[PDB]
From Swiss-Prot, chain B:
Function: Functions in nuclear protein import as an adapter protein for nuclear receptor KPNB1. Binds specifically and directly to substrates containing either a simple or bipartite NLS motif. Docking of the importin/substrate complex to the nuclear pore complex (NPC) is mediated by KPNB1 through binding to nucleoporin FxFG repeats and the complex is subsequently translocated through the pore by an energy requiring, Ran-dependent mechanism.
Gene symbol of the encoding locus: Kpna2
Location, primary (coarse class): cytoplasm
Molecular functions per Gene Ontology: DNA-binding transcription factor binding; nuclear import signal receptor activity
Protein name: Importin subunit alpha-1
GO biological process, one term: protein import into nucleus
Assembly with partners or alone: Heterodimer; with KPNB1. Component of a complex containing CSE1L, RAN and KPNA2. Interacts directly with CSE1L. Interacts with PLAG1. Interacts with APEX1 (via N-terminus). Interacts with FRG1 (via N-terminus). Interacts with ARL4A, CTNNBL1 and NBN. Interacts with ANP32E. Interacts with SNAI1 (via zinc fingers). Interacts with SNAI2 (via zinc fingers). Interacts with BAG6. Interacts with AIFM2; this interaction likely mediates the translocation of AIFM2 into the nucleus upon oxidative stress. Interacts with RSL1D1.
The record's note on its domains: Consists of an N-terminal hydrophilic region, a hydrophobic central region composed of 10 repeats, and a short hydrophilic C-terminus. The N-terminal hydrophilic region contains the importin beta binding domain (IBB domain), which is sufficient for binding importin beta and essential for nuclear protein import.
Whole-protein coverage range: 72 to 497 of 529
Region feature NLS binding site (minor), mapped onto this chain: 244-332
Subcellular location: Cytoplasm; Nucleus
Region (NLS binding site (major)): 71-167
A Gene Ontology cellular-component term: glutamatergic synapse
Amino acid sequence: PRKRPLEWDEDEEPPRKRKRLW
Amino acid sequence: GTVNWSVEDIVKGINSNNLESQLQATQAARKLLSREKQPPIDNIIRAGLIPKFVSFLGKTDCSPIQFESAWALTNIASGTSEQTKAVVDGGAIPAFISLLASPHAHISEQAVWALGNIAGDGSAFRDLVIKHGAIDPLLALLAVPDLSTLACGYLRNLTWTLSNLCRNKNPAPPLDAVEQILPTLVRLLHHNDPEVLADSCWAISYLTDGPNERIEMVVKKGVVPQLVKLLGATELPIVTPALRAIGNIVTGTDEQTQKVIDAGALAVFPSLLTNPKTNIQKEATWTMSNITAGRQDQIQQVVNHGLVPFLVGVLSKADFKTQKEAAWAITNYTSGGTVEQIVYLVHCGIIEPLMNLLSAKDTKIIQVILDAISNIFQAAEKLGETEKLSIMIEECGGLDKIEALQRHENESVYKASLNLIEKYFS
């Protein structure tokens, strides 16, 4: 039996970029 | 008085060559760029302001304009790739890296943040930041006896930026950069701030997302037991990436997988496999399927920890994506397991929830399930109990479902369903 990858739910991850609001 | 300026006013102030006028205009730009709704990023770029802001980063004699321009550039770089590119094109990278050495904490922090946005764009800008030499001075900011002495927001920003430097593939980060960063990540993994822990676990998740060699770099640091501990955290934002990392590790070799087991990971799965957060349950079940794809002694550990009933449970009721991972877990189990292990599986009640799932219209899961049933039949053959099994499958309505799959659209499906009926049902 093969080992398999799993899709990445992007909404779970830290932001890729962040705007500073204050 | 720096509130709600026009871009035209900002340009006028910045072109005045009066440093104080430039400072006020830059602050006004920062405030424009700080609004949540449709900041005029492209208008700022078109006005040609980026090179000016970058120049202001080098004004060691006017820290306030350094800070205001750093913040303004940070928010431009937080936009689209094209907007991040405009910042990079303006020479911002080496300028921000130099700012990491600022005696002003709020200024070095802003440089950390900006570099995180740039690296966060993708692997090219990530690697370009690394080439400019950002890692040394970034890591130096964390070289203190006790992380707890650093301001909370400051450490969080640093941790996040470091995680972005570990992020993305095609290609993955440079091997030597990873080796350079890891020891600091390991330390952060032992910190007590929930957000630092979450981002650190994500960093490790990125680094273990690849071939066994990449996984090995992490495992040899001895972090697995700490990751297992983090699996039990009450904060779900910690559990999610902790479990992702653990899952990534068990996609590796049997030996890397064994480290996860030896560290006691399996004892946490009764909770993970029933976790109210759908995505955690999904990746927990995914992780299980890769472990049941391991050696027979590893399948046996799954058995010993009482996790088979939990897999029957997930197969019986869960989000469909999770059930599909459970189907995979069962097929792997039946494929690599001993007859005794397979007997135990059936005794746990796997058959009914397997058959029930044949009703689903996902062609892959049907294939997975049919393969599992064939595997189980092979085991029954060695026992001459193939008749007990056929009866089991018919009594829970599986026969009816398998027979109808003979007419299935898909190739492998109606074939294998035919071999089953022809072979054990007639």
